[PDB]
Amino acid sequence: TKQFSVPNLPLNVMSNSRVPSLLNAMVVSPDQAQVVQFQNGRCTLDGQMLGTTTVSASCVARFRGKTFQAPDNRLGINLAEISGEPYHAFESPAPLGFPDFGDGDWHVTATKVTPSQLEANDPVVVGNVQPYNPQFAPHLGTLVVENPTPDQVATGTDLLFNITWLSNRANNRFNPWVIPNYGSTLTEAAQLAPSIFPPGFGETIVYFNSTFPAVGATTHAAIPCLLPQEFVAHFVNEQAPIRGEAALLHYIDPDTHRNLGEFKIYPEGFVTCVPNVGGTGPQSLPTNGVFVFVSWVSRYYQLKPVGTAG
Amino acid sequence: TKQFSVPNLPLNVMSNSRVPSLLNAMVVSPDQAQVVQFQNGRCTLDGQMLGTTTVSASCVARFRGKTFQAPDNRLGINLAEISGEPYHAFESPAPLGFPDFGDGDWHVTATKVTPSQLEANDPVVVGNVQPYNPQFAPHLGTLVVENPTPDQVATGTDLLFNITWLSNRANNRFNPWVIPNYGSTLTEAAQLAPSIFPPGFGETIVYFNSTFPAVGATTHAAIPCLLPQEFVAHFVNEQAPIRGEAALLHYIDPDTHRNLGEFKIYPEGFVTCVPNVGGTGPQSLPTNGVFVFVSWVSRYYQLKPVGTAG
Ligand SMILES: CC(=O)N[C@@H]1[C@@H](O[C@@H]2O[C@H](CO)[C@H](O)[C@H](O)[C@H]2O[C@@H]2O[C@@H](C)[C@@H](O)[C@@H](O)[C@@H]2O)[C@H](O[C@@H]2O[C@@H](C)[C@@H](O)[C@@H](O)[C@@H]2O)[C@@H](CO)O[C@@H]1O
Ligand SMILES: CC(=O)N[C@@H]1[C@@H](O[C@@H]2O[C@H](CO)[C@H](O)[C@H](O)[C@H]2O[C@@H]2O[C@@H](C)[C@@H](O)[C@@H](O)[C@@H]2O)[C@H](O[C@@H]2O[C@@H](C)[C@@H](O)[C@@H](O)[C@@H]2O)[C@@H](CO)O[C@@H]1O
Ligand SMILES: [Cl-]
Ligand SMILES: [Cl-]
Ligand SMILES: [Cl-]
Ligand SMILES: [Cl-]
Ligand SMILES: [Cl-]
Ligand SMILES: [Cl-]
Ligand SMILES: [Cl-]
Ligand SMILES: [Cl-]
Ligand SMILES: [Cl-]
Ligand SMILES: [Cl-]
Ligand SMILES: [Cl-]
Ligand SMILES: [Mg+2]
Ligand SMILES: [Mg+2]
């Protein structure tokens, strides 16, 4: 009998669930090629996270591990959870929050996190991770940092990594839809968050975008996700049981309470709308509105078209 | 009619409200030398943020601005809000989320954020900010990045800054309690979040600590804050009116459901406990417990001592 709700925070104060950035737009992308299968920002309406999704904003697209010396002055990393708890294979696709961008270089900045190594001196290590490299095995807990600086880092150093920026592979653009190949063969427990297929009734998937230093992207420096991280954290906190086939939301002007558009959020944890034909759908709406739960509805509830005709 | 609550997320999945890091401890510091007056992580129980506190996890201890050339190849920054909205003086102490560490160097990593500047090439600028230097004027919207790399950045470049690490000043240790001098004279509107005084009844302030690359700290790489960021986000979302002089919380083992300790959270937005005499108070409790609202209480409700005798 805990009733379902969404966070009533304005869109442009909530954050991406695949990079640590503010949300500043929502778009649709119906005629786009890739499957939709992000591993971060995946959460059911009753609060079960899927893939590698963490509830922790400060773990989104981070990773942590201990260093070892790999061939040709490459820096191997044995992964742990960002909390420092051990990471074991065969249970999830990768550690919690682990970045899910497969189509380009991760230019990373790391710091030492052992307090005894933080009494003095420069704790930073930088480098790049190439998820398309053959020595990228996050399911089994290991990856490589190419061209580290310093070249020489003592074995067993505990490092916490951030993605400072992403870039395209040579002669391609960087597609932020493409998830990594996590390697191995995943147990049933460690299964990827499923892919999401286009719903019916003229509906198209809604993406929440952030501007992000993603250099050479197909999207013009924009990272899409299926749910704001605050939605993930809200559903995990609430654990409201699913009581309908989908959940109708209204996107409200917060001051004047006018309804700016109708959306559906499905049990599997993604939002849809029906774009006004020939326009950008929700992209033209102001970004300072607030989502509110109206009611559960069935799958065939017909949404009012949102946006302008063009 | 909206009843008060706190997020029922385990402590060690919630995040600091003064740096973007996981919480991994809670401590007390009764014989602490400094006043308690953080500007980030400040929120009333009914959801009014104070100081520079933002609701947005991805704005905590970040800042943004446009570059200009300052004397001696110093890199001046004209601040904006992290959202890119303009920042104007005389309304807040500094932009939303602006870092509130005054006692040491900020070693910062910035990226370009203009999509047209992100089609190719390396978008990173690094440097350090010295909040104790005379050209640090965050209230009026301007600061300086010393020793930038590149040392030549075009004027008017939009940059988003993160604090990669902090370090002590020469011949001192870095005290993370010390807030910056924001400069100028603050209007009534732009007032600092007030300082917090020790409450009675044998209570002492509870700090939520993160391990963080703060080099040479008085705390050994630990950043304290008064509220998890998720508490800030929760109170802003809920807006539950204050209906008592303080709010009694229990810190519950989430599986065994047993009570590990009693705490009070006050309307002004800080947590207290009564340490068992001679011990570290809440510091010895497991960090995977969950805070639960019991009831409103008066200021003179007597907490059972928490922790061990030593
Ligand atoms: C090794 C190096 O410096 N290479 C330069 C190019 O940059 C590399 O380009 C690759 C794709 O072709 C890939 O994106 C690499 O990640 C990228 O290397 C990164 O960026 C450079 C600038 C350095 O900082 C490296 O340390 C870093 O790993 C560069 O290509 C241009 O920029 C990159 C970011 C990419 O957008 C590419 O498409 C652009 O043409 C070229 C020309 O500037 O110069 C070197 O080859
Ligand atoms: C300019 C420089 O390289 N200085 C070195 C010292 O580092 C500086 O120390 C200052 C305090 O005395 C202050 O913290 C500066 O921020 C710090 O400079 C930073 O760290 C160094 C290592 C470089 O990366 C700089 O680019 C950066 O700005 C260094 O002091 C020792 O480390 C620092 C972090 C601090 O903890 C200090 O107390 C330590 O003694 C010394 C000895 O290694 O070497 C240079 O002087
Ligand atoms: Cl019911
Ligand atoms: Cl709602
Ligand atoms: Cl989690
Ligand atoms: Cl240690
Ligand atoms: Cl049903
Ligand atoms: Cl219906
Ligand atoms: Cl009532
Ligand atoms: Cl209620
Ligand atoms: Cl509660
Ligand atoms: Cl805010
Ligand atoms: Cl009482
Ligand atoms: Mg899992
Ligand atoms: Mg203000």
Contact criterion met (CB below 8 Å) for A102 and A132: yes
State which of A167, A193, A227 marks the end of a domain. A167
Q: Are residue A41 and residue A172 in the same domain, yes or no?
A: yes
Using most ligand atoms within 8 A of CB, pick from A101, A164, A167, A169 the residue to mutate for ligand 1.
A167
Q: Are strands B270-273 and A104-112 parallel, antiparallel or unpaired?
A: unpaired
Same domain, B90 and B211: no
Cα Rg, chain A, nearest whole Å: 20
Q: Residue A176's closest CA among A12, A16, A4, A2? A: A16
> What are the structure tokens assigned to A116, written together?
């005894």
Place of tokens 């939303």: B96
Of B81, B163, B84, B57, give the one whose Cα is nearest residue A17: B57
Please choose, from the candidates B271, B118, B12, the residue with its C-alpha nearest in 3D space to the C-alpha of residue A219.
B118
Cα angle B17, B20, B21 (rounded to 5 degrees) comes to: 95
Give the C-alpha distances (Å, rounded to integers) separating B286 from B25, B196, B260, B290: 9, 27, 9, 10
Total domain count, chain A: 2
The C-alpha atoms of residue A79 and residue A160 are separated, in whole angstroms, by: 10
Ligand nearest to C-alpha A45: 4
Residue B148, SS3?
strand
**CA–CA distance, A58 with B59 (Å, rounded to integer):** 11
Would you put residue A216 in left (φ > 0), alpha (ψ -120 to 50) or beta? left
Separation CA A126–CA A147 (nearest Å): 8
Residue among B17, B58, B22 nearest B39 (CA):
B17
**Method used to solve the structure:** X-ray
Q: Which of A26, A177, A36, A42 is nearest to A97 (CA)?
A: A42
- For residues A20 and A130, membership in a common domain is answered with no
Residue at which a domain ends, from B136, B167, B198:
B167
What are the φ and ψ backbone dihedral angles of B112, each rounded to 5 degrees? -60, 150
**Beta carbon pairs, A and B, within 8 Å:** 130
Q: Among A195, A205, A177, A202, which residue's Cα sits nearest to residue A26? A: A205
- The answer on A221 and A279 residing in a single domain is yes
Q: Which residues are paired to B129 by β-bridges?
A: B106
Cα B189 from chain centre: 20
Q: Which residues contact A34 (CB under 8 A, 6 or more apart)?
A: A175, A177, A178
What residues of B are in contact with residue A84 (Cβ under 8 Å)?
24
- Based on the fold, state whether residues B271 and B173 are members of the same structural domain: yes
C-alpha dihedral (A23, A24, A25, A31), degrees to nearest 10: -70
A22, A82, A121 member nearest B56 (Cβ): A22
Binding site membership of A189 for ligand 1 (Cβ less than 6 Å): no
CB contact under 8 A, A216 and B119: yes
Amino acid (one-letter) located at B137: A
Among protein residues, the one with the nearest Cα to ligand 1's atom 2 is: B121
Three-class SS state of A237: helix
Which one of B139, B167, B195 terminates a domain? B167
CB crowding B70-95: b at 16 or more within 10 Å, else e:
beeebbbbebbbbbbeebebeebbbb
Q: Give me the residues near ligand 3 (ion), CB cutoff below 5 Å.
A: A 1
Alpha helical stretches, state H, B80-155: none
What stretches of chain A adopt beta strand conformation (E)? 25-28, 62-70, 74-80, 104-112, 124-129, 142-149, 158-168, 204-211, 214-215, 222-225, 246-252, 259-266, 270-273, 290-297
Residue A70 · residue A145 · CB < 8 Å: no
Q: Are A247 and A264 in contact (CB under 8 A)?
A: yes
> In this structure, are A21 and A150 located in the same domain?
no
Q: Which domain holds residue A225?
A: 1-59+168-310
Residue B34, both tokens: 């400094």
Ordered DSSP codes for A171-234? TS-B-TTPPP---S---STTPPPPPB---STT-EEEEEEEE--EETBTTSSEEEESS-HHHHHH
Measure in Å the smallest separation between the Cα of B202 and chain A Cα atoms. Answer: 31
Give the mutation candidate from B122, B169, B215 for the A interface (greatest A CB count, under 10 A). B215
Which stretches does DSSP call E strand in chain B? 25-28, 62-70, 74-80, 104-112, 124-129, 142-149, 158-168, 204-211, 214-215, 222-225, 246-252, 259-266, 270-273, 290-297
CB-based contacts of B257, cutoff 8 Å, min separation 6 = none
Q: How far apart are CA B125 and CA B106, in angstroms?
A: 14
Do A285 and A189 fall into the same domain? yes
Q: Give the total residue count for chain A.
A: 310
Within 8 A by CB and 6+ apart from A105, the residues are A128, A129, A130, A166, A167, A168, A169
Which of A164, A166, A209, A210 to probe the B interface (max B CBs under 10 A)?
A164
Give the DSSP H/E element, type plus range, for residue A238.
Answer: helix A229-238
Longest Cα–Cα distance of chain B, Å, equals 62
Q: Whose CA is nearest to atom 19 of ligand 1?
A: B122
Same domain? For A305 and A255 the reply is: yes
CA of A239 from ligand 9 middle (Å) equals 24
Cα separation, B223 vs B207, in Å, equals 9
A67 and A192 in a single domain? The answer is no
Are residues B84 and B31 part of one domain? no
Nearest CA to A47 among A267, A224, A246? A267
Task: To the nearest 10°, report the CA torsion of A48, A52, A57, A61.
Answer: -160
B92 is in an annotated binding site: yes
B231, containing H or E segment: helix B229-238
Compute the distance between CA of residue A101 and CA of residue A79 in angstroms, rounded to an integer: 17
The rounded distance, in Å, linking the Cα atoms of B176 and B224 is 7
Which of B309, B196, B288, B203 has its CA nearest to residue B248? B203
Do B113 and B184 lie in a common domain?
Answer: no
Q: Is A139 helix (H, G, I), strand (E, B) or coil?
A: coil
Q: How many CB atoms are located within 10 Å of the residue B281 CB?
A: 23
What amino acid occupies position B130?
Q
Phi first, then psi: what are they for B29, rounded to 5°? -145, 65
Q: Rounded CA gap, A24 and A15, in Å?
A: 9
Write out the two tokens for A65. Answer: 């591990």
Q: Are residues A51 and A190 in the same domain?
A: yes
Q: Fill in the DSSP letter of residue B181.
A: -
